[PDB]
Design a protein around this ligand. Structure first.
Ligand SMILES: Nc1ncnc2c1ncn2[C@@H]1O[C@H](COP(=O)(O)OP(=O)(O)O)[C@@H](O)[C@H]1O
Ligand SMILES: Nc1ncnc2c1ncn2[C@@H]1O[C@H](COP(=O)(O)OP(=O)(O)O)[C@@H](O)[C@H]1O
Ligand SMILES: Nc1ncnc2c1ncn2[C@@H]1O[C@H](COP(=O)(O)OP(=O)(O)O)[C@@H](O)[C@H]1O
Lengths: 283, 299, 273, 305, 306, 282
């Protein structure tokens, strides 16, 4: 159903918020998505964005992406909201870059454009990935952002516990100050169980034009549960060329236990270095 | 306007004739200790003897340290200005610290003829308004500047506030600090109560506000429900009074707008206990949501 | 307008004659008080007695943490502010090129309508000046126009701002070997009644002779200014029982309401822990 | 074209593979590491079979095991004279030129443009200089004439790279004209640079670690400590005896292989002083007592102070 | 020129040494310290024969021993009107004048020259302008008459010189138009300001410490602590009893000697207030227990906190 | 130059590696305590390499300049080490004569290589105390030395496995681990009792000092307890204390008296622990 496998309650959590926007009761709030990484917290917002009409704007940006050396965060954040403003014909991020080279000029100009109506203001949805590495003065811009009536519905995402804020020396929950934190809604996500992962491997192999046997799935569902999903996807295309070497006709279990014992996860390679400095750095 | 949309049930501070505090009146419930004390403060601005000092509302978060700031701005004439700023709204890099600290400060003083504040009119700006008092055409009504989260203001903007309150036409400002013997921001070594330095501690009246009971919490979420027009039942409200005493009140008032529309998802108009039993699992608070990432990492 | 301080007032007379006999050029005064011992009027204790025209300025040691202007240019204005010339004795900030005013007043001295004078300059909370500014008063004291500098602190053996070593009072040793450090012994029980009898008269309050004996029992463990903030609100609560004067039950009505800084950091230890 | 950094890697000439994707023992230069040389084989097939949409490799082994050699074999098994630009982690920090351009000085210097003149996309030379060159060479591959031959970028000691490089590099690989990038490391969990806050495996953020296929290289047995010195001796004309080689493999297993392979040319020009052109054991002891190594010469400075 | 840095020690005339290479009990405005007073006599001998191969003096010993005094007796044993210009460690930081200028200011406040009219090198006054001077005054010394006498710089508490000022001085002391520079400190293995991990003795870098000669200044006994306060009294024209010196000396043993010299001026002024002839045993106790010193007044801000 | 049997012999193998061009890509690192004359076995690679080789003895702490920037205290020092033979002139003084700029000269000197009327010469650059440098300056030795107009680097460091400045990753001798894979690390040794007299029977001849033979054996008894920095510093001060009674040679107490007068670098700070660490407890 519509690409999004699993996370049934946390997808229904959007269905609460999807009527908070149509009733007109989000104007000031914001939505956060917590969770262990590799779960779909970068993906629930997409189907969330599609459910406000056919042509909603959507701008997934990252929190470590704020380190732009040509583009200051006073202007990186400011066009980011204006890449989520509805203009019917073409958002406001592309308007000022050619028609001007101002941000108070087009708003007074769209104060004139509100009454004609060839383009109607439907401000869409944002997504700001990895908010736990977003500086403190950027959060104060988010407070000043949602004060226009042409505001977008902010969606955020964090994967860190009680940490410090980026700019101060206070340990606080999630790495957000508590001027926005208690105004936030926490759509929490859970890591997949056994049965949830082996549909995803069936999904990713279906769209990679890769044929696979049934017994290759249950070993890759052991690994896909333990290590990650995104490492188990990487072994799919690697085992699709250890099968093709013997020409295969189907990918098998020892065509995984070759490759799973050939490459490594994001986990074991550190552990090989752990017992490597036990006489090196313990002499 | 959303900054006081969470306080659209306070039409006054609710005191009787003898200067005492009654339980439930004009919106405010519980809190009868400190509502005596902010009755003293609003009477010390009606008698002009507030000789350059302020109010600090110590106590845990969510207990109502912002609703008194609108209550004091209600009892003082109810047409006064009000600008609740937060100590993290100053830390912006597009503008300097002190000007966005003063832009709210020049918004609190109400002038009377039309109803204007100083920020519409914004040294020589300070004197022509002082000239109009001399002629007697416009008399200033000092409103309430609420500074929440005051430990996030540094010592480089506090001494600005120790100057812009030292002048005569400044309004009453009200701090709110939900922490203890903190260490002052911007100076790296010195500590003081509530993150407020010594030079400003000489001008504050530390009014403590205490926590709530589950009986007091059930009255207030009814009032926020009855103001938004969302019919909730007592079995449902008793759960919100146990989610209230679990985390905060600010979380439990926040769930009224989604948990009503969960019945609109299900077709009904009212909130029952089975709805809030679901939306506690759908949306979380902020403290337990970092417990989960301390569990899913440390599993 | 003192009360008490049977020793540290007497030190202000010994320091006063050093300004007369010229034996003060190079030295300065350190007032190592508590916050609530009233050092600022003792700083004026040699400004109401040295000369009636000798000016003063009180700039905090945290005021130099400035964002509009630099650290030391804002200091040098507040250092020149204490030095006047008789005409009213006009300060050297209102004649404000930076050395021409120094060179012009090197001429005006013998004329008859302009004569140089020293002054007093008060730096309170002195321990928040870094070593960049302690080197400024290392050299600005050695000029021909040295004001009687009085420094006020409440910090013991601490780290200097700008360096990382230990030091008394936030002062580096080069401006501390040659200092007069006076100690202000804190207020006492007979010392606190007389200041509180002064303070009620300054706000037209008739007070009891027994509620004082609890207000001075309450004005010791907390502060003095806590017993000052009460006594203007203790007037208003009897202005709402209509009794025209204040008795012993009336402070413990408003002592219950308005907390102090020591019972409101322990009450932020009950919740927060 | 800096032909100095790969001077010691002149003896590798491929991967030394069988027909069905199995490693040999000693062919095309390398001896041993046959567990990881299989993993280079399935990597190099993917770059040929176009299933490498912007993905990277991170070899992860101790210092002195062949991480730079095994990422030159991936440069040559794609083809000979295929561009290969080895940089290191602490080379991006120049006070002259900003550090983001220094990666573009390398990440663009690992492509072979094919017209026949062959050139790198860097050597066609300011984000317009990066941007507008891409749309002409994107027109070139659909023009039915021209083509790129993507090489290998090699970043060693990656934990010195900071977060303003990792975010630019990961955002750079989304272009279709992006060559492969082969990382390296020698440590476990180590904090990121550029933000200096929290830990991460091998100094790699999770924004890049979903493009990472970790290949683990192992250590070397004392038997493997001798052929690898032998092949580096046979390229430089270093006539060395076996009884000294058994001492020289003892050096490679006492501290490191990289130290025990740069000892040869001082030990060859010690034997040219004494006269005997063929090296014996009497030289190479007196070049391991005279010269030292870093973890043993830091110990000596601790053995006094 | 400045005078108040010297006026507190306006009673030392020379080192007070007989020609037998030794010292005496007390002479020439000095007392005690017989181990160190010969050593500064050796250094003033090595300026006379110019065997000082770019060297310097470090005076390592506790505060209240006369490290400013002995390195002023050196500056006067070279001759009358030999320049002397002491600075402290935290002089070299100012927003008005940066680090390496105010070093060279006091470096060339010391370098005297006799062209007959006495001149310094800071009389003549951007290091391009400084190095331009050095060659042409290297002509005037080799014209024969214009002989230069090297002044004595005195750096007090040398630890607060940071690392980017020391190596300037190593590139400034190496000239032959250099004055003899005298460092002084009492700190232990001090971290140099700027390196954060290097433990070097009295805060001197390991290259500059190849030039200096470390001399101890030993703390006084209360016998020899008494005669100095008598000597500092009689230059002021301020009389005193005996037992007051048995108090002012035996409170100087308690904290420092640097404190007690700051007490002759108020305790005499306590006698002018009360209309007394001189200072006596109660006049000190109404200053010693009324005025305070920072090593014994910072304890009262910790006792009142606890 | 007396001593260093195990450091000059390896330095000869450093030398004759330059003659065959095998040094191209590497550098030397003389690891040892100071006082061992690390600037003496490094200038031997300027004496024995040829009498016309430029040789610059800068320090690593001397890069700390407020008037400079961290790309001009090294680009001068390489061009004050590389030179051109055409009275040989170094390459840095060619920048002076084209100023009253390297984007024209380093092609112009490369033009000279085909005629040979001006000949390039490989020099030697000495960077003493290189552990004070940092990665924003270590990356220029990986950036200039890989060129073909390059000298042979020689470094020196007494610090052990310490933190590199710039980061918080410890490493031997404060150098990046990428640069330490091409260093020729030759150690120096502490001196010997018969060998320490040789520098003292050559420092006495610097200032014609006549010294008794018990005094030599007690100065080396002094010099190997504390330092050779300090033992040289008592030579000259033994003279002007012997010129009281004129001596005809200094004596045993005469070197024992001035040893009681001046104090060495590590005994003197032991008296601070008798004061600074013994007043805090009391
Ligand atoms: N005593 C009270 N009377 C009326 N409303 C209250 C009371 N206490 C809390 N509230 C309501 O509960 C919410 C939380 O109070 P507030 O002080 O704003 O929380 P916080 O302490 O986080 O700022 C407010 O919206 C306020 O309207
Ligand atoms: N398996 C191998 N086959 C051939 N040569 C090798 C092998 N492993 C290491 N070497 C040689 O040893 C040296 C160290 O390898 P390299 O990867 O460059 O350093 P490190 O192993 O420390 O990353 C190289 O010069 C390489 O030529
Ligand atoms: N042995 C001494 N002989 C003569 N004067 C002394 C002696 N000891 C101290 N003084 C005087 O005491 C003062 C303190 O000496 P100074 O060196 O300035 O302080 P410190 O010893 O703490 O550095 C000096 O001005 C000096 O004149």
């Amino acid at each position: 159903s519509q690409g999004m496998v699993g996370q049934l309650a946390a997808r229904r959590a959007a269905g609460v918020v999807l009527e908070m926007i149509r009733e007109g009761k989000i104007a000031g709030r914001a939505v956060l998505i917590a969770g262990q990484p590799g779960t779909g917290k970068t993906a629930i917002a997409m189907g969330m964005a599609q459910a406000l009409g056919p042509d909603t704007p959507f701008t997934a940006i990252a929190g470590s992406e704020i380190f732009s050396l040509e583009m200051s965060k006073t202007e990186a954040l400011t066009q980011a909201f204006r890449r989520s403003i509805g203009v019917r014909i073409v958002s406001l991020h592309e308007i000022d870059v050619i028609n001007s080279r101002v941000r108070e000029q087009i708003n007074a100009k769209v104060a004139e454009w509100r009454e004609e109506g060839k383009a109607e203001i439907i401000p869409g949805v944002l997504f700001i990935d990895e908010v736990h590495m977003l500086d403190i003065e950027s959060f104060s811009f988010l407070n000043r952002a949602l004060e226009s009536d042409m505001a977008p519905v902010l969606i955020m995402a964090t994967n860190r516990g009680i940490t410090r804020i980026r700019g101060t020396s206070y340990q606080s929950p999630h790495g957000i100050p508590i001027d926005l934190l208690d105004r936030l809604l926490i759509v929490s996500t859970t890591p997949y169980s056994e049965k949830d992962t082996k549909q995803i491997l069936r999904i990713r192999c279906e769209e990679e034009d890769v044929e696979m046997s049934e017994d290759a799935y249950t070993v890759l569902t052991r690994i896909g549960l333990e290590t990650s999903l995104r490492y188990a996807i990487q072994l799919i295309t690697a085992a699709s060329l250890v099968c093709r070497k013997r020409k295969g006709t189907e990918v098998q279990v020892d065509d995984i236990k070759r490759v799973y014992s050939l490459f490594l996860d994001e986990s074991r390679s550190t552990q090989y270095m752990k017992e490597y400095q036990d006489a090196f750095l313990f002499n | 306007t959303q900054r006081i949309a969470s306080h659209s049930h306070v039409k006054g501070l609710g005191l009787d004739e003898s200067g005492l505090a009654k339980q439930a009146a004009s919106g405010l419930v519980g809190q009868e200790n400190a509502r005596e004390a902010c009755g003293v403060i609003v009477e010390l601005i009606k008698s002009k003897k507030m000789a350059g000092r302020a109010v600090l509302l110590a106590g845990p978060p969510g207990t109502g340290k912002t609703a008194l700031a609108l209550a004091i701005a209600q009892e003082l004439g109810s047409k006064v200005p009000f600008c609740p700023m937060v100590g993290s709204e100053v830390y912006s890099t597009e503008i300097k610290k002190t000007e966005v600290l003063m832009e709210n400060f020049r918004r609190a003083i109400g002038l009377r003829i039309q109803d204007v504040t100083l920020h519409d009119l914004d040294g020589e700006i300070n004197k022509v308004v002082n000239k109009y008092i001399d002629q007697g055409i416009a008399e200033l009504v000092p409103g309430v500047l609420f500074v929440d989260e005051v430990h996030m203001l540094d010592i480089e903007c506090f001494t600005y506030l120790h100057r812009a309150l030292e002048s005569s036409i400044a309004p009453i400002v009200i701090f709110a600090s939900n922490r203890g013997n903190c260490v002052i921001r911007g100076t790296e070594d010195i500590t003081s109560p509530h993150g407020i330095p010594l030079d400003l501690l000489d001008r504050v009246m530390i009014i403590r506000t205490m926590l709530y009971t589950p009986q007091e919490m059930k009255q207030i979420i009814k009032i926020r429900a009855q103001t938004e027009g969302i019919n909730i039942s007592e079995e449902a409200l008793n759960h919100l009074g146990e989610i209230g005493t679990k985390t905060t009140l600010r979380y439990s008032v926040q769930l009224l707008t989604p948990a009503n529309l969960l019945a609109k998802i299900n077709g009904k108009d009212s909130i029952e206990k089975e709805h809030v039993e679901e939306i506690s699992e759908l949306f979380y608070d902020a403290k337990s949501s970092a417990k989960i990432l301390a569990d899913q990492q440390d599993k």
